[PDB]
Amino acid sequence: GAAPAGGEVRRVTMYAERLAGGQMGYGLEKGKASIPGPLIELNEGDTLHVEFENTMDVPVSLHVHGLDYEISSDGTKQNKSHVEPGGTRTYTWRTHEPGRRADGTWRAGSAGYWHYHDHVVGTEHGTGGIRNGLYGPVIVRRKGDVLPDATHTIVFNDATINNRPAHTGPNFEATVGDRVEIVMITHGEYYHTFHMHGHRWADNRTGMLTGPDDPSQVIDNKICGPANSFGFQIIAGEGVGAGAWMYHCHVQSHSDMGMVGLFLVKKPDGTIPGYDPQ
Amino acid sequence: AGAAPAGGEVRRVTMYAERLAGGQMGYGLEKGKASIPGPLIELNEGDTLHVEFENTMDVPVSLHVHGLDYEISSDGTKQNKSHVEPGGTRTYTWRTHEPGRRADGTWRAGSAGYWHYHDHVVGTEHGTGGIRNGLYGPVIVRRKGDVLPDATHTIVFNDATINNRPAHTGPNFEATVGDRVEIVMITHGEYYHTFHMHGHRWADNRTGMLTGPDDPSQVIDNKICGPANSFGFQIIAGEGVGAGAWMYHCHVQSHSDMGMVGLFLVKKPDGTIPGYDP
Amino acid sequence: AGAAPAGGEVRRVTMYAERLAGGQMGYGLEKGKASIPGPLIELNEGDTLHVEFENTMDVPVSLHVHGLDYEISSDGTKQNKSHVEPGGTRTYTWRTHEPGRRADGTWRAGSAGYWHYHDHVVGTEHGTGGIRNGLYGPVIVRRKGDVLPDATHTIVFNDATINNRPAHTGPNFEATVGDRVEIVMITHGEYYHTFHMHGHRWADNRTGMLTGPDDPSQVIDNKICGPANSFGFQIIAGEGVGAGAWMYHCHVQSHSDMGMVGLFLVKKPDGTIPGYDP
Amino acid sequence: AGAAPAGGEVRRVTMYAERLAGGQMGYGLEKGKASIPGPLIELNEGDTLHVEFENTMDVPVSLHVHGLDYEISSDGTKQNKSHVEPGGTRTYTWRTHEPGRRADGTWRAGSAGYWHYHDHVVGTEHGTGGIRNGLYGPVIVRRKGDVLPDATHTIVFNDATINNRPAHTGPNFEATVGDRVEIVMITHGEYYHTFHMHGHRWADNRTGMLTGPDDPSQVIDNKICGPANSFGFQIIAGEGVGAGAWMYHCHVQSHSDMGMVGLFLVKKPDGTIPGYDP
Amino acid sequence: GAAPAGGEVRRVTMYAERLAGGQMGYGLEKGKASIPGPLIELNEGDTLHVEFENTMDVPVSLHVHGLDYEISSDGTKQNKSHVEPGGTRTYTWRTHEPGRRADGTWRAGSAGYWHYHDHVVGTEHGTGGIRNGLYGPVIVRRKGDVLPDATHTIVFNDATINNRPAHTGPNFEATVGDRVEIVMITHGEYYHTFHMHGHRWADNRTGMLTGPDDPSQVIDNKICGPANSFGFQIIAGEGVGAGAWMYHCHVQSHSDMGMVGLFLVKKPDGTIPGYDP
Amino acid sequence: GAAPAGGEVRRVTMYAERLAGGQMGYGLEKGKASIPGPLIELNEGDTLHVEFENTMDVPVSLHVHGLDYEISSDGTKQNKSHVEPGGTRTYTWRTHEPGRRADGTWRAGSAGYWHYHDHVVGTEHGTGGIRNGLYGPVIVRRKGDVLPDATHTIVFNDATINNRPAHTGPNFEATVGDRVEIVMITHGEYYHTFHMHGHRWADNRTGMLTGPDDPSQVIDNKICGPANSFGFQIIAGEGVGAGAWMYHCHVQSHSDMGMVGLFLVKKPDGTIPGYDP
Ligand SMILES: [Ca+2]
Ligand SMILES: [Ca+2]
Ligand SMILES: [Cu+2]
Ligand SMILES: [Cu+2]
Ligand SMILES: [Cu+2]
Ligand SMILES: [Cu+2]
Ligand SMILES: [Cu+2]
Ligand SMILES: [Cu+2]
Ligand SMILES: [Cu+2]
Ligand SMILES: [Cu+2]
Ligand SMILES: [Cu+2]
Ligand SMILES: [Cu+2]
Ligand SMILES: [Cu+2]
Ligand SMILES: [Cu+2]
Ligand SMILES: [Cu+2]
Ligand SMILES: [Cu+2]
Ligand SMILES: [Cu+2]
Ligand SMILES: [Cu+2]
Ligand SMILES: [Cu+2]
Ligand SMILES: [Cu+2]
Ligand SMILES: [Cu+2]
Ligand SMILES: [Cu+2]
């Protein structure tokens, strides 16, 4: 499938809730917070009203990258758009199509791989909240962008992936030929290099080349730093087959620390040849 | 919006390297008016620049430029004997070229882009002292037909500082909604950083703006950079988001927490910023 | 200049992993002829390479490749028994493919690009020990019609060193004004770097050369990179700048001060280098 | 209370290195009961200790101790062939000695003090990965006449963790007013730290207590420490300040913010803690 | 002179006010809070009731190092000893002399160079209130401790000295021979090394060797970290003469970025040889 | 051996010279600059006139920690006590014995493990000259201090030891029983922790306990920051035997990155068991 043209006014409920161990997550239903927060998907032109509720004892905010918003939905104490304990607030995100301005230039549309995160827990820049788990993916699709069979979000948050304990994945399963979307977000203090075995993508907006004239480097490794976000779509096992295809940060100490995980690609019968959790 | 013309002019300027307060050092076009960053040098592709340089300090100094064409005699390094002695004078010559087809059928990249110059001999043979002290500044080379901006602002991440300013002192930049605002982003020193602008985004290519609908450049509001990286871009101030104190900062979390933040102050036509208390 | 042909050949080469003087490890094509970096492997899109590999050491080793197509059996990891035992042999198979349109209508990125290979098992299960000891080398896969260079040099930033050489000891590379020179830049280990070349600049895309007037890729003389990053470019030596000893170095200030520096000795036709006192 | 007797005993003990939940690894004197911090070893000066060591893991491990006497054979390094291969055994032998007047007129420092042991070969030849996984424990060597404590609690700062415990999960320790509580403080990892204790203070000397009115050691409640530092002290719980939940934490602000905090739960004789409601 | 025996009950008012540019300081009188907060001196044995008053619109607290206080005066939120906006509270600090315990041990006295600071603003550990400036020095003297001609407090708070902007001192003035007391506190995120040109001290409780039997290292340079505190007294210009004697953090980027100051030591005739600011 | 009473007037010539790979060092003879610079030993009471020669193209200085010096030998641009390019200047260091003052307090002597370094190259705090190699050790001995068989200086300068490339030691060799003196200085930007295998020392002036009454902690691991110096003496292999005894920074990545060296202790014959270089 392909993404339609957008322009719908959408509405969703979000909650910030504490989780086990000092963690904090966003969710769509309450008691259902997740780290990372729920995937938000929009087509260019859509408006999203986030009816936001802070179920915690400390203030929290919701700040987004890439998308259009007014200063009232910045999500910062500096602009007084945070949410006091037990409070509620409507965060409005807008998105727009690319097009030709009157001056002759081309306006960049909103499409891309983006993210949202806290901006006031711990510090005026959300360092505690981000640490605590208050981050999530946002995909904005352009008319005609190819839709995946599945989307998986991988966040390098300091020395952890998705705030999971070290050496605990997460793992993603696919079958050969699946079109699999990866959303990649980085947070915290450190730079990282995200690597995938057996697969590769184009370093551009969609992670796929537009055609034979796209000169974007094709890569399997990409340096990123805090609040970087990119994404891509690969064909699972393409030209390489089924297997437990490793992905990991490729900074040596980081991978040794357990910033590693698995792309479990299965044949149609379900077999992953040679796979053997030790 | 203005457009840059074809270059090819031969230009001459004076430059001085001078001690400033508190152990700092800056370049300047007029004696006694050094600044950090140094003066913005703008050229059209094909232009030549003779920098009639004078070292008013008690230590050898140099001028090394990125991206432009220069013979070894204008390298600005000790090992080429192209530094300038205490009190000395030297003419540094930069050239630029248009792109074009070589006789071999390959395409020769032009000089156009966002560039910079800095010291290369103070403290160490790589100008570690001079760079820390403030001996850096922006260089813009335009291609014919590049869109010209209403204003240009230079933002240098230098170690843990912005433009060698004390933590938490900006700098801030002012615009009116709809202004065409050019940002030149330079990094120097020891540390990687990520530049982030609230409410605004640009394309990750030469100009910061997409050439049209065929350009697959990732559109971003966040970019990792390390010492001597330079990029630039243009935005329409407030476009789709409205007036406000729009934060820009390093997004490395402790860096933002320690004062590597500033304000893109986008004003309404009446000169006011809703919800900004100065 | 010549151009690369279309690929499609089955190629075979033997490889060995030896201890080298002073606690280092290397890859070589013949026994006793191992280097750091290992030997350059050049393929054309579509070629298959069978690497017949022998671990001549007293410790397990592996051979993991970036970017190329391989089955899981050639992942080169202990995690799925693709590692080699001391004295053991194994055939690692690498395939490549041209770009082309998939049945689902999308553009499948080809294998062409600047890649590398390295160990994945010495020291740790991510080859931290092996890479630090020197177990890495370059792979270039060319696409039909790619311009062929007069020379290729590989510069690997490994921890605080260039090509495991001791600090302040190059390497230097020689060329003659007008030579078409190809650089392969590989990063490994723990740190981020910025690679910089005096006198020269390239396009930030697959080939490092702009495809023509419609390629909007930034033109750069400086690039941040992190562990397992690889890129490449070609430059016309001395183009628009003439002969000389042109520095390349990491631009992280402490890194260049510690001696992560070298020289691109660009010679006049008579063999001389103006301004180079050796 | 009691006093340490003169030492001089030859002691034997079994130690096991084994995995735990989440990639962790610990030392124990019994199988299946390995812990983090490892078991507390207590000796009187002159005592010898033979640790019959078993490595019940699939990776090599070793035992290296601070402060105590040992030959190169018990160094516990890969470089002195004193590590323990997977599933191997080894007798690690530590010796201790009283102070004394040497022949050459000088005073020989005794072994008494607060020490520690940790792995030295897991992950790197310096045990970087082993220490990270929890392979560390405290050794106390007492001098004849040293005051003995009611209770000993070990606090290890291991990067961002206390005793490899998840963030904000203590650990807490319970005392009664008047108890003589002995704290051992070890530090590991990459980061410096400042251990702080509400309600109590101590002497910055060997034992943590002033020898008498002539001892000029600083009395502190806060001291800076870094990787492999070890010290200890004794306090009288509640002495002059009463019962309560007295906090202890690293005082580096970001460290305490992310939950490097525990509690010193000092109860009144009747078991109550005034104003401490969970 | 020298310090006498302690044992007096003292009382003081202290205020938590807002200051210019996002600051927050403590002060003994309304409108005159300072960064660092005022100097509190006591003799071992004294009690101090601090009549505290939060004049801000966020909660504040007062938490002290070294001295004796009941949990009632921890000055922390989880111990409900913090202070609401507008709110008042009495914090009570006690000090004790050293002496031999009945147990046979030696009980360490209260004497030392300590400090107080917020514990609630921004985080449950006072991260914001410390950054904003809510810190100040407390000195507990033992009977017989020599008294100084002046005391100067120097706080490394992140990349600042006393929350003052980079390259702005502070500077302190003395005359050759003055007995100058220095109190040094560290806060925030960074380690530092405090260095003093021209002078040295003993790394012990008073910063002066007790005599020939004191093995304490004599230093001019000390690494410290957040909440560390120590002090010393020096004879200004002793063995070195007048001059603008720098003090600075010796972490190189810190000193380049402005963590520097001047101990301006004059001759009796008032001169500072070669000083040329 | 034991240090005598000082009081000699001593004179040395010191050169600052450029060295290969962008470095600079101090040397006692022309053309013989070294990193670390030469070891300067004095007995308490000695005066040292250092007749300094700047052979380089940049202003340079000599700044000493711990010892007595007038402001004209401070070694900073601020009062023009640097040395211009090609120029000369005589820096004078003095040192005094411990003694009691008329005010009854104890004046600590100059004795200790000290150091000298540039203060003007690159920045006003010598950040370039320090990183380039302009640093060296100063030992001031007290009458009665025991004299070592040898002295080795280990300088943690940023992420190097003695400006040497990573993983290149340096190693120091001794024989079991040797009385070995270690001088340890830190410079630059980072903190470190110095650790030595199989040996230990007292955290005090000399690194040796004064006797059974000295409560100084006995350690084998110590945190240090920029411009810190300390030192000690150990009996090579005492109680532990001959062996390749590793010393390293114990910050884990620093040790993994080669901040490591070997204390090669040989048996009376000259061999080191277990040592397979
Ligand atoms: Ca691109
Ligand atoms: Ca002491
Ligand atoms: Cu943002
Ligand atoms: Cu922000
Ligand atoms: Cu990582
Ligand atoms: Cu953000
Ligand atoms: Cu350069
Ligand atoms: Cu930054
Ligand atoms: Cu440069
Ligand atoms: Cu891998
Ligand atoms: Cu580098
Ligand atoms: Cu790899
Ligand atoms: Cu060790
Ligand atoms: Cu800590
Ligand atoms: Cu406290
Ligand atoms: Cu150790
Ligand atoms: Cu606290
Ligand atoms: Cu500092
Ligand atoms: Cu505190
Ligand atoms: Cu200084
Ligand atoms: Cu270190
Ligand atoms: Cu110094």
Author numbering:
A (entry chain C): 41 to 318
B (entry chain A), C (entry chain B), D (entry chain D): 40 to 317
E (entry chain F), F (entry chain E): 41 to 317
Provide text from the study.
Laccases (EC 1.10.3.2, p-diphenol: dioxygen oxidoreductases) are among the very few enzymes that have been studied since the end of the 19th century. These multicopper enzymes catalyze the one-electron oxidation of various aromatic compounds, coupled with the full reduction of molecular oxygen to water. Most of the currently known laccases function in acidic conditions at temperatures below 60 °C, but two-domain laccases (2D) oxidize some substrates in alkaline conditions and above 70 °C. In this study, we aim to establish the structural factors affecting the alkaline activity of the 2D laccase from Streptomyces griseoflavus (SgfSL). The electrons from the substrate are transferred via the His–Cys–His pathway to the TNC, which is formed of one T2 copper ion and two T3 copper ions (T3α and T3β). For this purpose, we constructed mutant forms of SgfSL by combining previously obtained substitutions that significantly increase the catalytic activity of the enzyme (Met199Gly, Met199Ala, and Arg240His) with the substitution Asp268Asn that is outside of the TNC environment.
